[PDB]
């Protein structure tokens, strides 16, 4: 029906930095070899999408952003074996080629085919599948989910359970997996341990979820906005701390609370000060601190290497350390097995055409997560 | 014969910062409960001992320094079970009490009974076993090995193989274990991996030894002094790099050499610049960088947390991450089993009374290691 031909549909185009998204009629070309064309069903609004708007995540413009989504396969290009028309799917902003030294490494997941390190804003073949009135439009992280239809490389898509609620599991595309994996995969939280989570937005709640899944005995949420405490406790926080409530530095408060430091700490916020606070507040001999995000325009931080010499470990990761094509279907199956809940993370749902209102919600701090529906 | 009574012997006392060691007649009290009096046989001169002299490692003065040594047990206090008179022993500057949360942790080794974090310069009981003309003299890290006789807490001494050459195995007391463990225990170097070692002094050579023991396929020594290259290759370096030979930054040279980053890097030097270089030069997705030492007066370093967000791990450790009382006898047995050589690390041997000449050798860079013999 549409296979093999151009699809005319709507997409949200960002023509220039620091502008609202423009809803436009675009033409989406059919998939070439080893490409997959997908009809979007739902897409989440992530901070990283806002970083494109601000000019802080530098990627070629004009662009179709969006990287956290789920949809249904409309058609497949020549030689595609891992998905078929009609399959439910989640685009992978961190690809899993299976061939490169990172994909072949037991602990690596940042596949060398990614479009994040040096963004080209294209398909793997160096071209674009999008045009708006004959003007080419860039891809974003090989996903481009702010469109009714997108085309992705086979290495950037994963087949998921056909019974999945796509309006919920789209979170596995970025925010949930990123926080959850940071606990379960990167830190490797252990049973009965004490965890501290700095930032109680959607990613921080996902870290709490992971700490709970791993059986942490204490999970201390830290945030200056006390209206985030209720949800943090719902999803597994055992106590919450507001640093503004105190006369002493937060790392001291946490060190005293945990009888000499936490087992695992997580910095979600992206703030250089809490990155060092989170490191300092873990036990000096065996503590592990994980950086879950860094704003793309971050300056250097200043820290004393003596924090590490005692035996601390400091690490970061993309996409929760998950090998993406392997892990996403497993995470969906975990959701389908009722291992964890996704509803507490969803605070707003809007039709796709209201994408700008959704970004206002993001920017004001009012939403944990907004899902856009097609 | 001497058991139960004061021993008059010689020791090297540091009366004040920035002075030569003074050879003095001291009185060494007999061991109280759970203490061990040891006749020294050999002691190494370590950079950390020099840091006491400079005032950069702050510990109470006057003091008997020295922490890297081997000797024979002269007598034991009440209730001592782990050593007996006549046993060969190595004092442990990082104690292993066996009871604290760190000693009970599978990956911790910086026992909470250490005298490093907040030095008191005493025995565990808050007193000193040393006097010089009735003036009390401080202990150092619960060891104080720059004396013909010392008294240590039972938790700070390990029994070793009775056939051990003490003039060699004293290196297991600090320098060798610190570098070797950093590779084998902290980094956990894997077979066929590529390693980069920044600094080719005694500790760096020990890291190379560990990388070799673990079966690294490539071990790249990095140092601006090219006269250290010969020994680095003898002990396992596959190539050596002098950053002064290059027009481009060293991390780029290493990244290009290792086809996109090393598996493991080690900063030995203690320099804030190479700490960040060593981190940067490991593979961005799965690289591990280990800080093996930090000068005790180090200022803050400046680094971009984006280095970690891709998947790097940064860690440090004391005493090579070894639980000390467990590991030291195993390391001696490994030496007695001819698993590794210690001779390449020993460049100078002097009688104890020539301790000041040995520190001149250390300060000039002329020695890899000097051993002082009694
Ligand atoms: Zn790959
Ligand atoms: Zn995202
Ligand atoms: Zn202990
Ligand atoms: Zn030492």
Curated annotation (Swiss-Prot), chains A, B:
It comes from the Eukaryota. The keyword Chaperone does not apply. InterPro entries: ADH-like_C, ADH-like_N, ADH_Zn_CS, GroES-like_sf, NAD(P)-bd_dom_sf, PKS_ER. Zn(2+) 1 binds at residues 46, 48, 67, 174. GO terms for cellular component: cytosol. Pfam families: ADH_N, ADH_zinc_N. GO terms for biological process: retinoic acid metabolic process; retinol metabolic process. It catalyses: a primary alcohol + NAD(+) = an aldehyde + NADH + H(+); a secondary alcohol + NAD(+) = a ketone + NADH + H(+). An alcohol binds at residues 48, 67. SMART domains: PKS_ER. It is found in: Cytoplasm. SUPFAM superfamilies: GroES-like (SSF50129), NAD(P)-binding Rossmann-fold domains (SSF51735). It is an enzyme of class 1 (oxidoreductase). Disulfide bonds: none annotated. Belongs to the zinc-containing alcohol dehydrogenase family. Class-I subfamily. This is Alcohol dehydrogenase E chain.
């Amino acid at each position: 029906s549409t296979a093999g031909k151009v699809i005319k549909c709507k997409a949200a185009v960002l023509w220039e930095e620091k502008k609202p998204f423009s809803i436009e009629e675009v033409e989406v070309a059919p998939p070439k070899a080893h490409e997959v064309r997908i009809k979007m069903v739902a897409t989440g609004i992530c901070r990283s999408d806002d970083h494109v708007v601000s000019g802080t995540l530098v990627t070629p413009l004009p662009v179709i952003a969006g990287h956290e989504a789920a949809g249904i396969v409309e058609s497949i290009g020549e030689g595609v074996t891992t998905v078929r028309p009609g399959d439910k799917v989640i685009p992978l902003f961190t690809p899993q080629c299976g061939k490169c030294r990172v994909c072949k490494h037991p602990e690596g997941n940042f596949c060398l085919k990614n479009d994040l390190s040096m963004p080209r804003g294209t398909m793997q073949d160096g071209t674009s599948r999008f045009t708006c009135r004959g003007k080419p439009i860039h891809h974003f992280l090989g996903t481009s989910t702010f469109s009714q239809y997108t085309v992705v490389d086979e290495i950037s898509v994963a087949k998921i359970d056909a019974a999945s609620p796509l309006e919920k599991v789209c979170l596995i595309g970025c925010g949930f997996s990123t926080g959850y994996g940071s606990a379960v995969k990167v830190a490797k939280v252990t049973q009965g341990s004490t965890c501290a989570v700095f930032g109680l937005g959607g990613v921080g709640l996902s870290v709490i979820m992971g700490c709970k899944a791993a059986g942490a005995a204490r999970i201390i949420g830290v945030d200056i906005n006390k209206d985030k405490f209720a949800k943090a406790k719902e999803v597994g926080a055992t106590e919450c701390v507001n640093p503004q409530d105190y006369k002493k530095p937060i790392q001291e408060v946490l060190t005293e609370m945990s009888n000499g430091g936490v087992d695992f700490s997580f910095e979600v916020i992206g703030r250089l000060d809490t990155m060092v606070t989170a490191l300092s507040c873990c036990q000096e001999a065996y503590g592990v601190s994980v950086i879950v995000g860094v704003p793309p325009d971050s300056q250097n931080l200043s820290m004393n290497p003596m924090l590490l010499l005692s035996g601390r470990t400091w690490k970061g990761a993309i996409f929760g350390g998950f090998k993406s094509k392997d892990s996403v279907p497993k995470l969906v199956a975990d959701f389908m097995a009722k291992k964890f809940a996704l509803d507490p993370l969803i605070t707003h749902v809007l039709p796709f055409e209201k994408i700008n209102e959704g970004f206002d919600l993001l920017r004001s701090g009012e939403s944990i997560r907004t899902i856009l529906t097609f």
